[PDB]
Write a protein that binds this ligand. Structure first.
Ligand SMILES: Cc1cc2nc3c(=O)[nH]c(=O)nc-3n(C[C@H](O)[C@H](O)[C@H](O)COP(=O)(O)OP(=O)(O)OC[C@H]3O[C@@H](n4cnc5c(N)ncnc54)[C@H](O)[C@@H]3O)c2cc1C
Ligand SMILES: Cc1cc2nc3c(=O)[nH]c(=O)nc-3n(C[C@H](O)[C@H](O)[C@H](O)COP(=O)(O)OP(=O)(O)OC[C@H]3O[C@@H](n4cnc5c(N)ncnc54)[C@H](O)[C@@H]3O)c2cc1C
Ligand SMILES: Cc1cc2nc3c(=O)[nH]c(=O)nc-3n(C[C@H](O)[C@H](O)[C@H](O)COP(=O)(O)OP(=O)(O)OC[C@H]3O[C@@H](n4cnc5c(N)ncnc54)[C@H](O)[C@@H]3O)c2cc1C
Ligand SMILES: Cc1cc2nc3c(=O)[nH]c(=O)nc-3n(C[C@H](O)[C@H](O)[C@H](O)COP(=O)(O)OP(=O)(O)OC[C@H]3O[C@@H](n4cnc5c(N)ncnc54)[C@H](O)[C@@H]3O)c2cc1C
Lengths: 175, 170
């Protein structure tokens, strides 16, 4: 379970307060994903993650930013593969469930192993899922940036709304 | 821009599959801005933007490697992230449009951080950032911004969002 290398950063004095930083970042609305993987054992691990975006089309890359300590991150880097489950409009308590300080997060959660090393796919709770080979990981401040090469996954056009978060409220597509 | 070696699996999905998956992730809409060498304002529409770190306070943006806005941003070593609001549809289109002079008919003002263009109208908030690092990741450059200035507008009742080829408010 090795530590990724810290990214060399030029940090000027005169950076904002943590409170100013959240007031600024909390103005940017986001999706809600559950990043999943398989322990060395084969137990399903996951955490609620909002810091996800596409990086590259050719080759097909995305990134997630996870806290350095995360057990899911540790399992994810050991395994070398993870899934990004983009939560649907009804999945506000799936969000809270994968953010909760508990050991068995997948207790009474519907999931299937994916094509790529059996990473957990939450078919019932998602608008889409990506299955990724870990292409790179770098420590950047109090988070690790993980870059994933998309090996499999697909959209669910049958699901008409995503989960969205802005200024301490969840929302959905108006259907 | 740092060169980053990728442990790629032969077996990567094709471009259109990738877009169908990423298109299902709902995204805020921002205009990344900077000043050119002798102070021409540059800007592009950017949805690949997220919070990275509380302390130090970092955000990142992903931009095409061949971007002239990126080339100028890296030259000046600072940029702004303007988070567009509900009414900002046409501003998003303009800074996406493959045209010159994107700031023509746009209300902007130089920021406290190097005069990086802060957009007056059609924004819920702006961050001003020093370039802390930049990484080549396939066909994009990941720019890590250390937040030195900016603030929200609580009065602004909705940000711009984009999902499955539609804009919405919120
Ligand atoms: C969208 C979202 C993202 C979150 N990301 C993290 C996280 O990366 N690590 C973590 O430990 N807890 C995270 N949390 C939980 C968070 O720490 C607490 O809910 C926080 O105390 C609430 O502060 P706030 O209302 O100002 O921020 P929120 O309403 O939670 O969101 C403010 C913004 O802070 C950004 N952010 C970046 N790094 C952090 C960080 N270390 N802590 C909090 N917000 C951060 C997020 O992108 C978010 O958009 C997140 C919560 C939400 C809703
Ligand atoms: C809407 C939302 C978004 C979040 N986004 C992020 C995020 O992008 N990155 C992150 O690191 N945490 C994020 N969090 C916080 C994270 O889901 C919780 O802090 C979670 O409990 C940590 O899981 P862990 O196994 O890594 O924790 P450990 O401390 O390893 O548990 C043992 C978010 C939480 C919420 C509610
Ligand atoms: C939100 C959004 C983001 C875009 N990002 C880029 C970009 O970073 N670079 C670029 O050259 N063109 C980008 N474009 C332009 C786009 O690639 C073209 O318009 C193309 O025709 C795709 O349209 P589409 O309807 O198939 O998918 P869209 O609805 O245009 O895109 C679906 C999703 O795929 C991702 N995406 C799209 N294009 C790229 C890309 N080239 N690299 C990485 N992720 C991408 C984004 O997450 C987007 O939300 C973007 C367009 C939109 C609407
Ligand atoms: C909602 C949304 C989100 C997006 N998110 C992203 C994203 O996250 N990342 C991303 O990379 N893209 C993203 N895109 C796509 C991006 O905004 C467009 O591809 C944009 O046109 C790129 O601008 P650029 O300056 O980087 O392009 P460039 O190709 O560098 O230049 C843009 C235009 O400038 C002019 N020009 C070029 N060279 C010169 C010159 N020497 N002198 C004068 N004029 C010149 C030309 O007309 C050229 O077409 C997004 C688009 C949308 C709609």
């Amino acid at each position: 379970p090795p530590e990724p290398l810290s990214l060399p950063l030029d940090l000027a004095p005169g950076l904002v307060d943590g409170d100013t930083f959240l007031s600024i970042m909390g103005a940017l609305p986001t999706g809600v994903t559950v990043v999943t993987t398989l322990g060395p054992d084969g137990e399903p691990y996951g955490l609620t993650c909002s810091a996800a975006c596409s990086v590259s089309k050719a080759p097909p890359l995305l990134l997630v930013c996870i806290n350095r300590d995360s057990r899911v991150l540790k399992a994810l880097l050991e395994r070398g593969e993870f899934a990004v489950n983009v939560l649907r409009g009804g999945g506000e308590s799936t969000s809270a469930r994968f953010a909760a300080p508990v050991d068995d997060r997948f207790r009474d959660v519907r999931w299937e192993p994916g094509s790529a090393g059996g990473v957990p796919v939450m078919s019932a709770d998602v608008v889409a899922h990506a299955e990724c080979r870990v292409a790179a990981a770098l420590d950047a401040g109090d988070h690790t940036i993980v870059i994933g090469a998309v090996v499999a996954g697909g959209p669910r056009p049958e699901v008409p709304s995503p989960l969205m978060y802005w200024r301490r409220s969840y929302a959905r597509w108006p259907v």
